[PDB]
Amino acid sequence: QVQLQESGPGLVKPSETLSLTCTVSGGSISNYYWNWIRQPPGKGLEWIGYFYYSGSTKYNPSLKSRVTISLDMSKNQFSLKLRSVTAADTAVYYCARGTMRESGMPDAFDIWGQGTVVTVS
Amino acid sequence: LKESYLEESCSTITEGYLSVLRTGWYTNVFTLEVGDVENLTCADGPSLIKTELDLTKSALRELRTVSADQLAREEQGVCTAAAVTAGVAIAKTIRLESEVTAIKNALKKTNEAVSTLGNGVRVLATAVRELKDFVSKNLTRAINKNKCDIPDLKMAVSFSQFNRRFLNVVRQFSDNAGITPAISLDLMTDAELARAVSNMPTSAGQIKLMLENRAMVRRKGFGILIGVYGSSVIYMVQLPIFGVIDTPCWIVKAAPSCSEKKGNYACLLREDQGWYCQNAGSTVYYPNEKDCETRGDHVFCDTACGINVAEQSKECNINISTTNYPCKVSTGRHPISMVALSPLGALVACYKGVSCSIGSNRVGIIKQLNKGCSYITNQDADTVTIDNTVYQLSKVEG
Amino acid sequence: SYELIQPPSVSVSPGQTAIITCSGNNLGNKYACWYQQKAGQSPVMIIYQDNRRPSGIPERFSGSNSGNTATLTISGTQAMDEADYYCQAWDSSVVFGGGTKLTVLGQ
């Protein structure tokens, strides 16, 4: 059922490189956008960047020079690496699935993950 | 009806236009009759309505001359011209041997009857049989002993009533040498276009749309002259067939991409600038931009000029030197300032130190533009003024 | 940049139609989609393209788009949903709405 599973660390010291990983079960095909969405406390959704199946990256324009998104298709998963992480970057991170070809191509997020909490201290 | 800006390539995409694609042609065969005025009580007595019968005789003469000259050129939309050859070929088959004899026998009592063909292609046949109802029944005994036009005053006027159609159609055929790119109101009338399209080999979906846009249905249909057989006129007209009624379609409008630092105006320039539509899960592209007409939301297109492009070409919107589908884009530095008139807004690119600003015609020149490509819509501004070449914007909203 | 501004709280009586406005600047020119995020759980899509409904959402969940406001309509609201309805409209940054908290008054 093309389910999503996000896993990784949970506690990153400041001024280091957070790492995360979302594993897909049911096909990471060149038909869906794979993006990371984070939600800091206070409940305001924020978009970090999407990853298309080929080399196609596009990040939030307040978060460039810090975010890198890659692919690990051999195991059907994709990862992320923040940088210069600060106490302001404590948030729940979601990995979601986006369809294509109804608005510019980018369209809404069909299914999301479960959410892994990341804290900075 | 919904436009978005592709800042990666200085391009806009509008994605609210359905489409209707033409697929086939529905042939109809017409059989008009000229009556019995070939030789009927002419004599030598000048009159008023006697000068109207010789017009009919001259119409017959010119209809025979143009039909004879029609088979003299056959000595062994631009994209739609491939259908003109098919229309000529189908007419050649019907006009030869005794196919017309079978066609005429098929309508010996009924004005409407579907008839087959030697190749098995279904063809509809129609007969008006109205002129003979007056020239033979309501005119024969009136003109007697060559004493013309005196013993009547009302039937003299009514003779011109049942004469306009033949004269108009023969004038058209003589002027255009048989091929009529437009279906005029003389060749085919009303109650013969809601009746001669409702027998088309399609479903209930596109027939309603054809009944609503019979105007453009007439605009895209052409007819040819078959010939003259005795006291009868034989000709056929081709009607467009629309395969699909509602498929997602969109437009792409391109312009120079950007500039570069250190005074080197070197960027890219897209040359896509067309329409896209889907038929069977494979998007088709029309290589020209003057190929389809917008009527409200729907778009009318012909499946004889579009080009099928392989899927996974979807990500021509993202231009990061993509590996999957290489989008065909021209290369060259060659900066040219231009403004692309997008449907819901406008796309502006001026680089060579030329003043560019917008104007709403009421507030004046406000919010002067920048050197780079920017998106201006028809609500935050009404004109894009450069020098003295003010550009207007459409009133349609979406 | 750009920001979709929507009211942060909407109070709806049970059984009465709920409308949530999402006032962008040049909206209607671009496609807008909505999300539904109950407390705790991850969000789930509700409406996309302002009129569609992907899979399995109850019929009492519709939206519109006109002028400069895209409105989400919930006909006959129930106590079952008190989620956080965000917007989204791609302007090269995926601007999200501020979030709207429906209150069916609990009981």
Structure determination method: cryo-EM
Sign of the CA dihedral B86, B88, B93, B95? positive
Is residue B2 less than 8 Å (CB to CB) from chain A? yes
Q: Is residue C23 part of a domain?
A: yes
| Residue B331 and residue B268 in contact, taking contact as beta carbons nearer than 8 Å | yes
| HEC string for chain B | CCEEEECCCCEEEEEEECCEEEEEEEEEEEEEECCCCCCCCCCCCCCCCHHHHHHHHHHHHHHHHHHHHHCCCCCCCCCCHHHHHHHHHHHHHHHCCCHHHHHHHHCCCCCEEEECCCCCCCEEEEECCCCHHHHCCCCCCCCCCCCCCCCCCCHHHHHHHCCHHHHHHHHHHHHHCCCECCCCCCCCCCCCCCCCCCCCCCCHHHHHHHHHCHHHHHHCCCEEEEEECCCEEEEEEEEEEEEECCCCEEEEECCECCCCCCCCCCCCECCCCCEEEECCCCEEEECCCCCCEEECCEEEEECCCCEECCCCHHHHCCCCCCCCCCCCCCCCCCCCCEEECCCCEEEEECCCCCCCEEECCCCCEEEECCCCCEEEECCCCCEEECCCCCECCCCCCC
Nearest CB among C35, C90, C96 relative to A46 is that of C96
CATH number, domain with residue C42 = 2.60.40.10
* Rg, Å, chain C Cα set: 13
* Rg, Å, chain B Cα set: 29
Q: Is residue C49 part of a domain?
A: yes
State the Cα–Cα distance between residues A31 and A101, nearest whole angstrom.
10
State the Cα–Cα distance between residues C41 and B73, nearest whole angstrom.
78
Two tokens at B131? 């002129």
Q: How far, in whole angstroms, is CA B94 from its chain's centroid?
A: 25
Nearest CB among A61, A109, A113 relative to C93 is that of A61
Domain B23-242, second-level architecture:
Orthogonal Bundle (1.10)
- Cβ contact A44–C93 (<8 Å): no
Tell me the resolution in Å.
Answer: 3.3
Q: In terms of CATH, what superfamily is A3-120?
A: Immunoglobulins (2.60.40.10)
Residues in chain C, how many?
A: 107
Q: Is residue C93 part of a domain?
A: yes
Instruction: Report the number of distinct structural domains present in chain C.
Output: 1
Q: How big, in percent rounded to 5, are the helix, strand and coil portions of chain A?
A: 5, 45, 50
Instruction: Give the residue numbers spanning the domain of C85.
Output: 9-103
Two tokens at C11? 């109070």
Domain spans, chain B: 3-19+247-385, 23-242
Is residue C92 less than 8 Å (CB to CB) from chain B? yes
State the Cα–Cα distance between residues B329 and B257, nearest whole angstrom.
12
Residues of chain B found within 8 Å of residue A101, distances taken between Cβ atoms: 314
- The contacts of residue C59 (CB under 8 Å, 6+ apart) are none
State the Cα–Cα distance between residues C77 and B103, nearest whole angstrom.
67
Closest CA to B27 of B95, B90, B112, B119: B90
Residues of chain C found within 8 Å of residue A43, distances taken between Cβ atoms: 84, 99
Q: Is residue C2 part of a domain?
A: no
Two tokens at B173? 């055929």
Q: Is residue C3 part of a domain?
A: no
Q: What is the DSSP letter of C36?
A: E
Nearest CB among B7, B15, B377 relative to C26 is that of B377
Longest dimension (CA), chain C: 42
Strands (E) in A15-90, as ranges, are: 19-25, 33-39, 46-51, 57-59, 68-71, 77-81
Nearest CB among A54, A100, A101 relative to B323 is that of A54
- Cβ contact A47–C93 (<8 Å): yes
Q: What is the DSSP letter of C72?
A: E
- Cβ contact B322–A57 (<8 Å): no
Q: Is residue C1 part of a domain?
A: no
| Residue B337 and residue B10 in contact, taking contact as beta carbons nearer than 8 Å | no
Chains contacting B with at least 3 CB pairs below 8 Å?
A, C
Residues of chain C found within 8 Å of residue A46, distances taken between Cβ atoms: 96
